[PDB]
Design a protein around this ligand. Structure first.
Ligand code: NA
Lengths: 224, 214
């Protein structure tokens, strides 16, 4: 019956600030402590601090004091966390939890970046040489410099699914970059076409990139 | 400032096996230790509170116990939904602290990676950049080393690695390594190499290309 409902994901600029909310229901809000936690991607949970709604007293992990400010609204049964002077180390999922870590909100992802919405550049990844016959060849697509997440990558518009995987994106210098891999029999390429399809809904772009053999040729991209 | 040391950070295990995660507290914390579970979609749930009480909605395969300053979460018979992240935490003193967590993964036999190196495409060079990429695909166990060399000299700056999640169908891992240089730097050198080494390797796997060659 206890529920904690947080606000959605945010994109914020470095040096700016962001306010996250956690609406509580199903229990008397003033009788329990509220907690805020941080989780950098791929890393562990960190405790930010608590706020007791009955008097809005607060205690912080010393590491976050001044960086995070907790507040609570007794009538609305909502706790807020405000993050100030953001930097890239602040991109993370932030969680709300009721004492004693008994119930949890779903998490709110905060992404800090100076970037404007930016469609990906899509680049072919073809072998540098050493073609081997009667085997498998691995090709790929480099999806680079886009913002914000996400992108969808498909191969031969779904025809090539055997031996396909896309690596998770990495946010570097304010923009994301990811690559996707596909493995097909050598008898099927280059004799038959292999193409990656890349969708980026924030920028409304959709692009196809045929993979062709490497050589010293210039301008393959104007034709593929 | 209590330190909780959770171990191991990665636990390989199999369906139906019994396993025990451990959390050693740097100071006496009595019974005030909780265990949390975190699913891949990011959601978190408390499994146990006060060292041994199961939380409502927790299957009884989960149990928790204590032995001196060593606390343990035990799963009697692993189900597939259990290969996820787990964290211990203490509320005996503030600030509250959390262990670094444990990820359960599926054990399988050793598998050598397939390594591919990809020279930058012509398009990228016209825009001023040069990303060389290397794929290390379908290997097991997850740990692996990758090294970039430019004309025989190892390069560590400008390198960015990314790992896939354990594959749902064959339990292998894959990793991509991308080296990004200015277009001008890439043209000052000829040879480029991705060198991988894994526990399955008798010798390192060397993949390379020469820029002035086709
Ligand atoms: Na080299």
């Amino acid at each position: 019956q206890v529920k904690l409902e947080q606000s959605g994901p945010e994109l914020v600029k470095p040096g700016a600030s962001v306010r996250i909310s956690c609406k509580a229901s199903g229990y008397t809000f003033t009788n329990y402590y509220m907690y805020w936690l941080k989780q950098r991607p791929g890393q562990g949970l960190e405790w930010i601090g608590w706020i007791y709604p009955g008097n809005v007293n607060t205690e912080y992990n010393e590491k976050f004091k001044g960086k995070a400010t907790l507040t609570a609204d007794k009538s609305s049964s909502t706790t807020y966390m405000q993050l100030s002077s953001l930097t890239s180390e602040d991109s993370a999922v932030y969680f709300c939890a009721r004492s004693v870590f008994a119930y949890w909100g779903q998490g709110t992802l905060v992404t800090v970046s100076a970037a404007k919405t930016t469609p990906p550049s899509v680049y072919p990844l073809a072998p540098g040489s050493a073609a081997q016959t009667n085997s498998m060849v691995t090709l790929g697509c480099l999806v680079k410099g886009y913002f914000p997440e996400p992108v969808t990558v498909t191969w031969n518009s779904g025809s090539l699914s055997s031996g396909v995987h896309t690596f998770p994106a990495v946010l570097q210098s304010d923009l994301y970059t990811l690559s996707s891999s596909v493995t097909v029999p050598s008898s099927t390429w280059p004799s038959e076409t292999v193409t990656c399809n890349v969708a980026h809904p924030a920028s409304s772009t959709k692009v196809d990139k045929k993979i062709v053999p490497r050589d010293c040729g210039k301008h393959h991209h104007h034709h593929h | 400032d209590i330190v909780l040391t959770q171990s191991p950070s990665s636990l390989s295990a199999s369906l139906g096996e019994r396993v025990s995660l451990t959390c050693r507290a740097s100071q006496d914390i009595g019974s005030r230790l909780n265990w949390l579970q975190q699913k891949p979609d990011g959601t978190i749930k408390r499994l146990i509170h006060g060292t041994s009480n199961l939380d409502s909605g927790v299957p009884k395969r989960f149990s928790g116990s204590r032995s001196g300053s060593d606390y343990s979460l035990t799963i009697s018979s692993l189900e597939s939904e259990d290969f996820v992240d787990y964290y211990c935490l203490q509320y005996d003193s503030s600030p509250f602290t959390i262990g670094s967590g444990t990820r359960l993964e599926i054990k399988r036999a050793d598998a050598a990676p397939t390594v591919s190196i990809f020279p930058p495409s012509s398009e990228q060079l016209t825009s001023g950049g040069a990303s060389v990429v290397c794929f290390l695909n379908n290997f097991y166990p997850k740990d692996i080393n990758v090294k970039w060399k430019i004309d025989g000299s190892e390069r560590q700056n400008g390198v960015l690695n990314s790992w896939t999640d354990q594959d749902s169908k064959d339990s292998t891992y894959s990793m991509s390594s991308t080296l990004t240089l200015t277009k001008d730097e890439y043209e000052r050198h000829n040879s480029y190499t991705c060198e991988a080494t894994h526990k399955t390797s008798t010798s390192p796997i060397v993949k390379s290309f020469n820029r002035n060659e086709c």
